Design an enzyme around this catalytic site. Sequence first.
Site, PDB file in Angstrom:
ATOM      1  N   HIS A  64       0.850  -1.208   0.000  1.00 47.44           N
ATOM      2  CA  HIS A  64       0.000   0.000   0.000  1.00 47.44           C
ATOM      3  C   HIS A  64       0.881   1.251   0.000  1.00 47.44           C
ATOM      4  O   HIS A  64       0.388   2.331   0.408  1.00 47.44           O
ATOM      5  CB  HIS A  64      -1.021  -0.082   1.149  1.00 47.44           C
ATOM      6  CG  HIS A  64      -0.401  -0.185   2.499  1.00 47.44           C
ATOM      7  ND1 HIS A  64      -0.056  -1.388   3.066  1.00 47.44           N
ATOM      8  CD2 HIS A  64      -0.075   0.757   3.405  1.00 47.44           C
ATOM      9  CE1 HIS A  64       0.512  -1.175   4.242  1.00 47.44           C
ATOM     10  NE2 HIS A  64       0.482   0.130   4.503  1.00 47.44           N
ATOM     11  N   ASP A  71      -0.622  -8.275   5.303  1.00 48.22           N
ATOM     12  CA  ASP A  71      -0.380  -9.740   5.270  1.00 48.22           C
ATOM     13  C   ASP A  71      -1.728 -10.457   5.192  1.00 48.22           C
ATOM     14  O   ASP A  71      -1.767 -11.626   5.609  1.00 48.22           O
ATOM     15  CB  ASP A  71       0.412 -10.208   6.511  1.00 48.22           C
ATOM     16  CG  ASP A  71      -0.231  -9.871   7.850  1.00 48.22           C
ATOM     17  OD1 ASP A  71      -1.210  -9.107   7.865  1.00 48.22           O
ATOM     18  OD2 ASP A  71       0.254 -10.364   8.856  1.00 48.22           O
ATOM     19  N   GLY A  72      -2.788  -9.759   4.804  1.00 50.05           N
ATOM     20  CA  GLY A  72      -4.118 -10.361   4.703  1.00 50.05           C
ATOM     21  C   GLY A  72      -4.773 -10.568   6.053  1.00 50.05           C
ATOM     22  O   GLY A  72      -4.301 -10.009   7.025  1.00 50.05           O
ATOM     23  N   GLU A  97      -8.670  -6.974   7.774  1.00 51.01           N
ATOM     24  CA  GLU A  97      -9.297  -7.217   9.099  1.00 51.01           C
ATOM     25  C   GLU A  97     -10.777  -6.775   9.021  1.00 51.01           C
ATOM     26  O   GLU A  97     -11.130  -5.985   8.118  1.00 51.01           O
ATOM     27  CB  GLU A  97      -8.533  -6.503  10.227  1.00 51.01           C
ATOM     28  CG  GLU A  97      -7.002  -6.664  10.179  1.00 51.01           C
ATOM     29  CD  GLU A  97      -6.404  -8.065  10.023  1.00 51.01           C
ATOM     30  OE1 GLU A  97      -7.083  -9.003  10.357  1.00 51.01           O
ATOM     31  OE2 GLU A  97      -5.255  -8.217   9.535  1.00 51.01           O
ATOM     32  N   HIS A 114      -3.413   2.095  20.380  1.00 54.09           N
ATOM     33  CA  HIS A 114      -2.072   1.521  20.132  1.00 54.09           C
ATOM     34  C   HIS A 114      -1.364   2.281  18.987  1.00 54.09           C
ATOM     35  O   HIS A 114      -0.194   2.747  19.193  1.00 54.09           O
ATOM     36  CB  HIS A 114      -2.194   0.004  19.908  1.00 54.09           C
ATOM     37  CG  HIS A 114      -0.892  -0.720  19.810  1.00 54.09           C
ATOM     38  ND1 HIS A 114      -0.340  -1.406  20.875  1.00 54.09           N
ATOM     39  CD2 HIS A 114      -0.034  -0.850  18.759  1.00 54.09           C
ATOM     40  CE1 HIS A 114       0.835  -1.915  20.482  1.00 54.09           C
ATOM     41  NE2 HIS A 114       1.052  -1.581  19.160  1.00 54.09           N
ATOM     42  N   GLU A 115      -2.018   2.334  17.790  1.00 55.09           N
ATOM     43  CA  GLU A 115      -1.416   2.956  16.601  1.00 55.09           C
ATOM     44  C   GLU A 115      -1.104   4.413  16.915  1.00 55.09           C
ATOM     45  O   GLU A 115       0.042   4.805  16.635  1.00 55.09           O
ATOM     46  CB  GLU A 115      -2.281   2.780  15.341  1.00 55.09           C
ATOM     47  CG  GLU A 115      -2.354   1.349  14.891  1.00 55.09           C
ATOM     48  CD  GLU A 115      -1.021   0.599  14.904  1.00 55.09           C
ATOM     49  OE1 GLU A 115      -0.995  -0.479  15.493  1.00 55.09           O
ATOM     50  OE2 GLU A 115      -0.023   1.121  14.393  1.00 55.09           O
ATOM     51  N   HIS A 118       2.112   4.865  18.722  1.00 59.37           N
ATOM     52  CA  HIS A 118       3.258   4.879  17.794  1.00 59.37           C
ATOM     53  C   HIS A 118       3.352   6.242  17.048  1.00 59.37           C
ATOM     54  O   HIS A 118       4.484   6.734  16.820  1.00 59.37           O
ATOM     55  CB  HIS A 118       3.081   3.717  16.833  1.00 59.37           C
ATOM     56  CG  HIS A 118       3.303   2.346  17.361  1.00 59.37           C
ATOM     57  ND1 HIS A 118       4.395   2.009  18.090  1.00 59.37           N
ATOM     58  CD2 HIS A 118       2.638   1.196  17.105  1.00 59.37           C
ATOM     59  CE1 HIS A 118       4.342   0.723  18.385  1.00 59.37           C
ATOM     60  NE2 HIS A 118       3.317   0.175  17.684  1.00 59.37           N
ATOM     61  N   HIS A 124       6.763  -0.361  21.663  1.00 61.28           N
ATOM     62  CA  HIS A 124       6.044  -1.402  22.440  1.00 61.28           C
ATOM     63  C   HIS A 124       6.523  -1.431  23.912  1.00 61.28           C
ATOM     64  O   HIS A 124       7.687  -1.091  24.222  1.00 61.28           O
ATOM     65  CB  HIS A 124       6.220  -2.735  21.717  1.00 61.28           C
ATOM     66  CG  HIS A 124       5.444  -2.818  20.447  1.00 61.28           C
ATOM     67  ND1 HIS A 124       5.837  -3.658  19.403  1.00 61.28           N
ATOM     68  CD2 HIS A 124       4.293  -2.215  20.063  1.00 61.28           C
ATOM     69  CE1 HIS A 124       4.971  -3.553  18.421  1.00 61.28           C
ATOM     70  NE2 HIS A 124       4.017  -2.651  18.793  1.00 61.28           N
TER      71      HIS A 124
END
Length: 159
Positions: A64, A71-72, A97, A114-115, A118, A124
């Site tokens: 992308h 990864d699907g 997802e 979470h995102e 970052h 983490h």
Amino acid sequence: MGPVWRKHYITYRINNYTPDMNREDVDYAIRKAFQVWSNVTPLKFSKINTGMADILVVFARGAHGDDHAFDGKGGILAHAFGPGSGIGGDAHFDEDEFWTTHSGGTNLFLTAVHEIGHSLGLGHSSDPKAVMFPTYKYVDINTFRLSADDIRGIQSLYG
Ligand SMILES: O=C(Cn1cccc(O)c1=O)NCCc1ccc(-c2ccccc2)cc1
Ligand SMILES: [Ca+2]
Ligand SMILES: [Ca+2]
Ligand SMILES: [Ca+2]
Ligand SMILES: [Zn+2]
Ligand SMILES: [Zn+2]
């Protein structure tokens, strides 16, 4: 420390909407995810509908346009770039997802917290109660809170 935003006022834009959810539910999840970080920092988040934003939110699948193909369905649900210009700060959600408002598929709000972690410059956590712990577990969104480690983390970056 890794990179940090050089300003306390930070803009975001939703590039596109997952068809998994109502548009309004996406806006709310993202808004509430920024509010979680707003509540424990000096940082102010401003939604822009058109034009330049620090943090671009994207739903994309597979390869992308960055060096980090998804990864699907399953495995990696999302990533984000730390503070910087261009793709810096941007949060990417794997459209393979099934994004939801609830415990089914993948809860967008929890994943966005979470995102955006970052996007603000957090790595983490080794604490399993931290939102910045590497793996997704659904937790009750009504009772949801940042762990002491998540607060320590983002407060060591801003304030
Ligand atoms: O994409 C992931 C997690 N994940 C899952 C299965 C297989 C994987 O290879 C894998 O990486 N993580 C980044 C997204 C993320 C991490 C932690 C949370 C989270 C959710 C609720 C409470 C605390 C942390 C949410 C989203
Ligand atoms: Ca995936
Ligand atoms: Ca950016
Ligand atoms: Ca999807
Ligand atoms: Zn990406
Ligand atoms: Zn992560």
